[PDB]
Amino acid sequence: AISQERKNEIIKEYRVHETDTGSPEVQIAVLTAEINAVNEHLRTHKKDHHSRRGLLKMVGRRRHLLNYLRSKDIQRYRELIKSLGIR
Amino acid sequence: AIKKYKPITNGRRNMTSLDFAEITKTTPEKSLLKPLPKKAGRNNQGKLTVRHHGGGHKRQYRVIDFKRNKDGINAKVDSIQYDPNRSANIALVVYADGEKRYIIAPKGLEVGQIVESGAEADIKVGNALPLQNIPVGTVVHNIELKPGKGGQIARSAGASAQVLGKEGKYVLIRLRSGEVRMILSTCRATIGQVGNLQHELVNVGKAGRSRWKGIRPTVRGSVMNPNDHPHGGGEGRAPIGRPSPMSPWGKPTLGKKTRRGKKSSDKLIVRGRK
Amino acid sequence: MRTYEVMYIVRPNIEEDAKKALVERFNGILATEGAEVLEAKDWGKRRLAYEINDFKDGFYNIVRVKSDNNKATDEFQRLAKISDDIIRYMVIRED
Amino acid sequence: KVCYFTANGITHIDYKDTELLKRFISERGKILPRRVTGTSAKYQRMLTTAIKRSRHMALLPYVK
Amino acid sequence: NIENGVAHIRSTFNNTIVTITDEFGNALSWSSAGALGFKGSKKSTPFAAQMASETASKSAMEHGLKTVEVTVKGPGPGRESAIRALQSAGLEVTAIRDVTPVPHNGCRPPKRRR
RNA sequence: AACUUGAGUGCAGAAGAGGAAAGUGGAAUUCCAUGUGUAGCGGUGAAAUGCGCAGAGAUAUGGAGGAACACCAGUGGCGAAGGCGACUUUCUGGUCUGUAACUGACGCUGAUGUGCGAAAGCGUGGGGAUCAAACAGGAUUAGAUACCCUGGUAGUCCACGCCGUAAACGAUGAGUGCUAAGUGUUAGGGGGGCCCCUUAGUGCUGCAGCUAACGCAUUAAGCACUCCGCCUGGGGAGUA
């Protein structure tokens, strides 16, 4: 999907502290770019059912990470939901 | 694409029309329009010669360049427009230094694409160039038959011939019917298939919609009287009581080959279909 | 970023003056749209393993290109198909 | 027996190297089974790819 | 001619068609096992192939044939007897190539019997 | 409130017929046009229908078109399953190894739901080489609406939709941990071509243990815990 250099700017943007890659703000943000990339791919290759299956797993992972973030603190959930455009 | 009307009326159940989405300007040009007064099957004497032709919506003729001969000067596609006198669409083109003229719209010609007539032209959709310079295997429309006359062969929605090979002064071309033939090399074509590929899938529905293109009802011959048609007469409905189905004027109609023999095109048709 | 090696075969009966006219122009598209051709080698008239359009021999040219656009190599194949001099071509992504 | 791709250290079989490939094409251009040539499974795959690329570019015969 | 006339032999589980043509593919003569009066289960026999080959081989000598290339096409029992039926007539067999077509797939083989 | 082993992310690597789109090839089949060519070809257990003498089969050259990709090729690989083998390019999914840089339980299962789902089948529009359900014959039989032979239509191919079934099987739900070994193969890692150790797959023997038996056995059908689906004699009947 997204290139390694592309991924890093997403990491730098939403990192909580420096040297942070596993927080549920960068993981969610990275998946959002990855999800949109596969969504754009499937606009052309509509019957890529095997690729679409991996998209549904990414959506589930982000959904579970968003549920965890909301259950931890609502403030960070609200900031992350508006910056990324997630409804 | 095709839009399927909802069955709000019976006379409109299975109707379908063209979505007219490829069209971009819905109005003509005052200087490339000349008058077309409907003739309705009538001749120089005033007698019905061809039948099933009559009243219909007025139409202005749009002068088309079937002989794409502006060689060297480039042209921009300004608007793909609707034509009432043909199945395919037309595209206004503006030449690189002021003149503008209509052509036939290829399949995926887009607004703002560039097209070139000539002989040094590339092989891209829309550009016209002689059949000596068109590679073997290319889909061509608007093929001339005579040097300088104008495209004649392959001009209706979804018409495409394939340049299949060479001889000497003639190129081999498989026309849409399935016929392989030869056309002089100094004659021009245009790269690509003609658009409105969905023109053949439309359903008319209304009797009146068929009676808007200038069609008039056609009566089956098996109900005219013996003095009107060979299949006419009989007390009741009758089968065709002759060895062969016949035509109004007395000439076999289910199989008889009506192509004049001893024609000067016979040496040029390789295999034939239809 | 992406590196391509393009090998194409020219028919063995081409006029010598036209050979440099074709090789020049066809390495010309391979340098367009961000392409920065590195190598452009000639392999000479070698024997083909099988007849290609009733030809037993042919000129081999190998051109290595590098560009993150990929349209230079697609433009090559579009014109290589049209041209009657090139009888076989192949584009390999080298990594 | 020894692979010749692990023994000599070749980590990239090139389809332009026709001479190296002609050792695995037998008498027809037929790809020789790896049991006969003793190359490993990892190199039988990239050698098959190189051979098929050479055949298309007429550097190796399909049949002989 | 003088020499170099290839002979094509079609050995199947039925008769063996033997044809002798020039080097450029122009038939001179031909003789199958079925043209010699052989009935079925006689047609695909080494004995029938023996006469099948030499019967066309004699017709070749009238055009003056001194060299034959044996191109065998088919997995039939009457193959080897056919080749030795050419040397026994003195045709100086040079090459023995098998040309039985091998598809690289690309066709559905007819269903087998049951 | 705290923690990393679970689960994920980061970094360094690995292999792969995983999927979609567009191109490029070689062999072969069929048909067509010619040159040569002469009385058969083809098929069976034997036949014959059948194709030929209006020149068939064969052979040589050329052309048209469709479909599938020999050799590589394997208890090989990938995928959740169905399935995926010519080559190239573009998008794109998943998995494994090592490290320990980050979060600190964010996990499992999962009714309803929502998607995918072999072949065959249907609609629309194309395409149609090969093989062919059905159909025609020719045989065998006492009869043969069958196996054998000769042809032959839909279909088999493509693009969209629909269908949603298979002995769709490892006839074995998913997750987690423990419990003798021996010997392979695939993809990595670390040490001293060889040896040792190790991770994840895939195989064959084989302990304890389980089973009615067959057999399974670290890829359980053993020992445990969580969750879902399913069964309660055979017909009637997967029928109302």
Side-chain angles (χ1 to χ4, degrees), chain E residues 55-76:
Chain E
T55 287
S57 95
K58 314 283 101 142
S59 276
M61 320 297 224
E62 164 268 333
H63 295 85
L65 286 280
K66 312 291 155 271
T67 304
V68 86
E69 285 52 43
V70 182
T71 305
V72 277
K73 187 165 134 208

Side-chain angles (χ1 to χ4, degrees), chain D residues 3-58:
Chain D
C3 180
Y4 186 153
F5 291 111
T6 83
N8 304 353
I10 300 122
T11 43
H12 159 14
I13 305 168
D14 201 308
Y15 80 102
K16 309 151 100 40
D17 192 354
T18 286
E19 229 47 43
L20 178 47
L21 301 167
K22 299 167 100 34
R23 303 170 29 51
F24 309 96
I25 84 158
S26 99
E27 313 100 47
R28 305 326 173 106
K30 268 210 198 38
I31 315 164
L32 279 179
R34 71 177 205 112
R35 42 148 204 267
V36 153
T37 88
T39 189
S40 60
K42 204 182 121 157
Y43 289 99
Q44 180 67 30
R45 286 179 310 242
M46 38 165 32
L47 153 78
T48 306
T49 293
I51 283 177
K52 286 163 163 178
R53 284 152 156 213
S54 307
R55 281 161 165 197
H56 184 269
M57 281 331 267

Side-chain angles (χ1 to χ4, degrees), chain B residues 122-124 135, chain C residues 75 78-79 82:
Chain B
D122 249 338
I123 296 96
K124 264 132 160 18
Chain C
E75 244 310 352
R78 187 190 68 83
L79 293 161
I82 293 161

Side-chain angles (χ1 to χ4, degrees), chain B residues 245-258:
Chain B
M246 225 68 180
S247 62
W249 288 282
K251 309 222 163 63
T253 191
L254 216 66
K256 260 278 307 211
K257 293 271 247 302
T258 62

Side-chain angles (χ1 to χ4, degrees), chain B residues 11-23:
Chain B
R12 165 121 173 171
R13 305 217 137 251
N14 290 136
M15 181 163 317
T16 300
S17 180
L18 274 176
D19 72 1
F20 295 129
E22 291 97 80
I23 279 102

Side-chain angles (χ1 to χ4, degrees), chain C residues 43-62:
Chain C
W43 255 25
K45 270 188 57 37
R46 328 173 49 120
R47 243 283 280 282
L48 308 174
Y50 43 89
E51 273 222 311
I52 305 183
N53 304 317
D54 268 291
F55 289 122
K56 304 211 39 51
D57 282 14
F59 294 81
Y60 283 77
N61 315 52
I62 289 116

Side-chain angles (χ1 to χ4, degrees), chain B residues 165-199 201-265:
Chain B
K166 292 189 292 185
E167 208 63 55
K169 40 202 299 172
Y170 285 99
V171 155
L172 259 81
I173 187 143
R174 182 184 270 131
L175 315 166
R176 265 295 297 223
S177 316
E179 186 191 89
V180 182
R181 208 203 176 260
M182 305 171 231
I183 295 184
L184 277 146
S185 297
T186 47
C187 296
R188 288 161 171 271
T190 318
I191 310 290
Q193 190 182 6
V194 317
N196 232 359
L197 250 72
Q198 306 237 306
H199 176 278
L201 275 186
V202 168
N203 197 324
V204 178
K206 289 163 66 73
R209 197 196 186 193
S210 179
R211 206 168 150 85
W212 281 334
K213 293 182 183 293
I215 314 307
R216 288 192 92 257
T218 174
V219 191
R220 282 143 53 238
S222 190
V223 307
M224 314 179 168
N225 283 300
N227 73 303
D228 292 326
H229 195 282
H231 289 163
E235 295 272 47
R237 272 204 239 289
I240 290 159
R242 340 211 350 154
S244 144
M246 225 68 180
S247 62
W249 288 282
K251 309 222 163 63
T253 191
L254 216 66
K256 260 278 307 211
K257 293 271 247 302
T258 62
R259 170 174 152 86
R260 326 265 191 221
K262 281 134 163 303
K263 211 174 136 163
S264 211
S265 64

